[PDB]
Design an enzyme around this catalytic site. Structure first.
Site, PDB file in Angstrom:
ATOM      1  CB  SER A  48      77.653  57.041  38.307  1.00 39.13           C
ATOM      2  OG  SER A  48      78.145  58.227  37.692  1.00 39.13           O
ATOM      3  CE  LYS A  51      77.134  60.108  42.006  1.00 38.91           C
ATOM      4  NZ  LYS A  51      77.544  59.874  40.594  1.00 38.91           N
ATOM      5  CB  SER A  96      74.510  60.330  38.495  1.00 35.30           C
ATOM      6  OG  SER A  96      75.494  59.334  38.664  1.00 35.30           O
ATOM      7  NE  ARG A 228      72.739  54.294  30.874  1.00 34.96           N
ATOM      8  CZ  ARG A 228      73.011  55.330  31.662  1.00 34.96           C
ATOM      9  NH1 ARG A 228      74.123  55.342  32.387  1.00 34.96           N
ATOM     10  NH2 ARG A 228      72.171  56.357  31.729  1.00 34.96           N
TER      11      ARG A 228
END
Ligand SMILES: *C(=O)[C@H]([C@@H](C)O)[C@H]1C[C@@H](SCC/N=C/N)C(C(=O)O)=N1
Ligand SMILES: [Cl-]
Ligand SMILES: [Cl-]
Length: 243
Positions: A48, A51, A96, A228
């Site tokens: 993702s 993007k 997302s 993350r």
């Protein structure tokens, strides 16, 4: 060496029984830091995080007219519930929403997608695979340090797309802001090809400086996704970038 290695940041990965790399770039001083110089240059599927260039390209080619254009849900129920509704560029980035971006890639097309990724100097510039999934299970690969390089050009409006396209995407990247810092960033979770990894790439804006960052970590199950941002913020706090 160029980049400085700071092995003490491994403590934040080990604390959560995890392995990965954080890379930072101090824009004012033109200095880079990372806990693992080898993994910092290891190239992965972008998932993702793609993007960001896909949004830029769709805007510049007029596939996306602006950040308010609504992309209607196709009616097919998917496993992430936030995907099963209408979206604009802002909400599709936030949640997302892959199927919206897959339609963008189909409208952009193989030939133009390839030339723009070469213009962007993006990763290995290889779009082999399906036009609408190559960043999920095709040939494109990008390292953490390569994400920084790409993000720096975006920050300075230096990619070969319009300034307006670049401003809109940076707006859509807005993730967090308070009276001390602004974070613009994008998350990624690569699951179709081993090894499963999570991504977080972007930058931290301060009054007098900007700190770019790119991180990835092993992600065998989805229960670790919060790490993350958590590990990255631990590194940012240790370096006194954020309080
Ligand atoms: C892109 O990186 C991902 C896409 C390829 O599936 C999307 C999906 C979310 S994670 C799925 C929801 N997890 C629940 N536990 C995502 C992300 O959070 O980075 N990106
Ligand atoms: Cl995507
Ligand atoms: Cl903004």
């Amino acid at each position: 060496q160029g980049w400085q290695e700071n092995k003490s940041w491994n403590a934040h990965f080990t604390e959560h029984k995890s392995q990965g790399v954080v890379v930072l770039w101090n824009e004012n001083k033109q200095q880079g830091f990372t806990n693992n110089l080898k993994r910092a240059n290891q190239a992965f599927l972008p998932a993702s995080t793609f993007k960001i260039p896909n949004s830029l390209i769709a805007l510049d080619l007029g596939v996306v007219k602006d950040e308010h254009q609504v992309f209607k849900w196709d009616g097919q129920t998917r496993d992430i519930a936030t995907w099963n509704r209408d979206h604009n560029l802002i909400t599709a980035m936030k949640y997302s929403v892959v199927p919206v971006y897959q339609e963008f890639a189909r409208q952009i097309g193989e030939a133009r997608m390839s030339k723009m990724l070469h213009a962007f100097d993006y990763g290995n510039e290889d779009i082999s695979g399906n036009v609408d999934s190559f960043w999920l299970d095709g040939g494109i690969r990008i390292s953490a340090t390569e994400q920084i390089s790409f993000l720096r050009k975006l920050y300075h409006n230096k990619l070969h797309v319009s300034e307006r396209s670049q401003r809109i995407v940076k707006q859509a990247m807005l993730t967090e802001a308070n009276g001390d810092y602004i974070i613009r960033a994008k998350t990624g979770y690569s699951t179709r090809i081993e090894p499963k990894i999570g991504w977080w790439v972007g930058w931290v804006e301060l009054d007098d400086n900007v700190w770019f960052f790119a991180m990835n970590m092993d992600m065998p199950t989805s229960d670790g996704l919060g790490l993350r941002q958590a590990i990255t913020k631990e590194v940012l706090k240790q370096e006194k970038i954020i309080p």
